[PDB]
Enzyme design. Structure first.
Site, short mmCIF file in Angstrom:
data_model
loop_
_atom_site.label_atom_id
_atom_site.label_comp_id
_atom_site.label_asym_id
_atom_site.label_seq_id
_atom_site.Cartn_x
_atom_site.Cartn_y
_atom_site.Cartn_z
N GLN A 19 0.83 -1.23 0.00
CA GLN A 19 0.00 0.00 0.00
C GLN A 19 0.84 1.25 0.00
O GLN A 19 0.31 2.36 -0.16
CB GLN A 19 -0.95 0.07 1.20
CG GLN A 19 -0.30 0.44 2.53
CD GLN A 19 -1.29 0.36 3.71
OE1 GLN A 19 -1.86 -0.71 4.02
NE2 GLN A 19 -1.51 1.50 4.37
N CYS A 25 -5.21 1.45 3.84
CA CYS A 25 -5.34 0.07 4.30
C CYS A 25 -6.84 -0.34 4.31
O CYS A 25 -7.20 -1.49 4.04
CB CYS A 25 -4.71 -0.08 5.68
SG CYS A 25 -5.32 1.14 6.87
N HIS A 162 -6.35 0.60 11.79
CA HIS A 162 -5.83 -0.11 10.63
C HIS A 162 -6.75 -1.16 10.02
O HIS A 162 -7.18 -2.07 10.72
CB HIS A 162 -4.51 -0.77 11.03
CG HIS A 162 -3.69 -1.27 9.89
ND1 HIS A 162 -3.48 -0.53 8.74
CD2 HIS A 162 -3.01 -2.44 9.71
CE1 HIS A 162 -2.71 -1.22 7.91
NE2 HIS A 162 -2.42 -2.38 8.48
N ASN A 182 -1.97 -8.65 5.49
CA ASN A 182 -1.72 -7.21 5.57
C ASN A 182 -1.46 -6.67 4.16
O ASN A 182 -1.51 -7.44 3.17
CB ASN A 182 -0.54 -6.94 6.51
CG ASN A 182 -0.59 -5.57 7.19
OD1 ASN A 182 -1.43 -4.71 6.89
ND2 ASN A 182 0.34 -5.36 8.11
C1 LIG Z 1 -14.07 7.92 6.62
O1 LIG Z 1 -12.78 8.14 7.25
C2 LIG Z 1 -12.69 7.67 8.54
C3 LIG Z 1 -13.70 7.87 9.49
C4 LIG Z 1 -13.56 7.37 10.79
C5 LIG Z 1 -12.39 6.68 11.16
C6 LIG Z 1 -11.36 6.48 10.21
C7 LIG Z 1 -11.53 6.99 8.92
C8 LIG Z 1 -10.17 5.81 10.48
O2 LIG Z 1 -9.53 6.12 11.49
N1 LIG Z 1 -9.69 4.80 9.60
C9 LIG Z 1 -8.41 4.01 9.70
C10 LIG Z 1 -7.51 4.52 8.75
O3 LIG Z 1 -7.97 5.18 7.81
N2 LIG Z 1 -6.18 4.28 8.97
C11 LIG Z 1 -5.01 4.75 8.15
C12 LIG Z 1 -4.02 3.64 7.78
N3 LIG Z 1 -3.19 2.76 7.48
C13 LIG Z 1 -5.05 6.03 7.32
C14 LIG Z 1 -4.37 6.04 8.68
C15 LIG Z 1 -8.64 2.47 9.55
C16 LIG Z 1 -9.68 2.17 10.43
C17 LIG Z 1 -9.56 2.53 11.77
C18 LIG Z 1 -10.59 2.27 12.66
C19 LIG Z 1 -11.76 1.66 12.20
C20 LIG Z 1 -11.90 1.29 10.85
CL1 LIG Z 1 -13.39 0.52 10.23
C21 LIG Z 1 -10.84 1.56 9.97
O4 LIG Z 1 -12.80 1.40 13.05
C22 LIG Z 1 -13.55 2.63 13.37
C23 LIG Z 1 -12.82 3.48 14.46
C24 LIG Z 1 -13.13 4.99 14.35
C25 LIG Z 1 -13.34 5.40 12.90
O5 LIG Z 1 -12.21 6.18 12.44
#
Ligand SMILES: COc1ccc2c(c1)C(=O)N[C@H](C(=O)NC1(C#N)CC1)Cc1ccc(c(Cl)c1)OCCCCO2
Length: 215
Positions: A19, A25, A162, A182
């Site tokens: 990625q 991710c 993640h 992963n």
């Molecule tokens: C529509 O954009 C959003 C909205 C809310 C977000 C997140 C993203 C979020 O934090 N997503 C995590 C993520 O994007 N991780 C990265 C990597 N590698 C970019 C930093 C990856 C991620 C993290 C947590 C998660 C989910 Cl489903 C996905 O469960 C939900 C927890 C709170 C939601 O956090």
């Protein structure tokens, strides 16, 4: 539930992708689940396009991240359940940047209709994983950084950061464990994969489990 499953053998799993320096991710987990649900729907196993989501998903933040559920919604609400091949829409945000969305020129490799959320319970999950195949899940990745092989049983489990793919498990083992794919290339963990203890909510893995729906 079976003693051990592994959809890699059943041929529902594409090779491990990279990625890059981009927070997509969420888009890999999504695509990997759609890859497996389409295969297990009795099709040629095919590699689907993560760049599609990164550049075109208006509900998410491309290389800033997103939610697997919101990718599933956008593929349905915004793309008529259509998913382009990797081949025809190759991954190019490997070094961090976000090209514009191009809707033409690509070829559809898979289709979906809906998605589903699964319970925050581990036998339950084991029961869906083994009946349906790879499941899009979210994890605390803090302890993935230092990971070098074997079964993680002391994972930091304090925050979901993640998206990854759950592909199998094994209860016959001491401790029992999940198989997780992963998106950090095959040069990480065990040729791309990581095994964590099953039955303790290791790395908070049962929190945000989902899967798309085919047909
Ligand atoms: C529509 O954009 C959003 C909205 C809310 C977000 C997140 C993203 C979020 O934090 N997503 C995590 C993520 O994007 N991780 C990265 C990597 N590698 C970019 C930093 C990856 C991620 C993290 C947590 C998660 C989910 Cl489903 C996905 O469960 C939900 C927890 C709170 C939601 O956090």
């Amino acid at each position: 539930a079976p003693a051990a499953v592994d959809w890699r053998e059943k041929g529902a799993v594409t090779p491990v992708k990279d990625q890059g320096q981009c927070g997509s991710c969420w888009a890999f987990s999504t695509i990997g689940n759609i890859e497996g649900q389409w295969q297990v729907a009795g099709n040629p196993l095919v590699s689907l396009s993560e760049q599609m989501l990164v550049s075109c998903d208006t509900i998410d933040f491309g290389c800033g991240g997103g939610l697997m559920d919101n990718a599933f919604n956008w593929i349905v609400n915004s793309n008529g359940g259509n998913v382009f091949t990797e081949a025809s829409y190759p991954y190019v945000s490997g070094n961090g940047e976000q090209p514009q969305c191009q809707m033409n020129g690509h070829e559809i490799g898979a289709a979906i209709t809906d998605h589903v959320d699964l319970p925050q319970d581990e036998d339950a999950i084991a029961a869906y994983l083994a009946e349906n195949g790879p499941l899009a899940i979210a994890v605390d990745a803090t302890s993935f950084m230092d990971y070098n092989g074997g079964i993680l049983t002391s994972c930091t489990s304090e925050q979901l950061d993640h998206g990854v793919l759950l592909v199998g498990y094994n209860d016959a083992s001491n401790p029992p464990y999940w198989i997780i794919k992963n998106s950090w290339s095959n040069m990480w963990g065990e040729d791309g994969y990581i095994r964590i203890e099953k039955g303790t909510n290791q790395c908070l893995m049962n929190q945000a489990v989902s899967s798309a729906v085919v047909g």
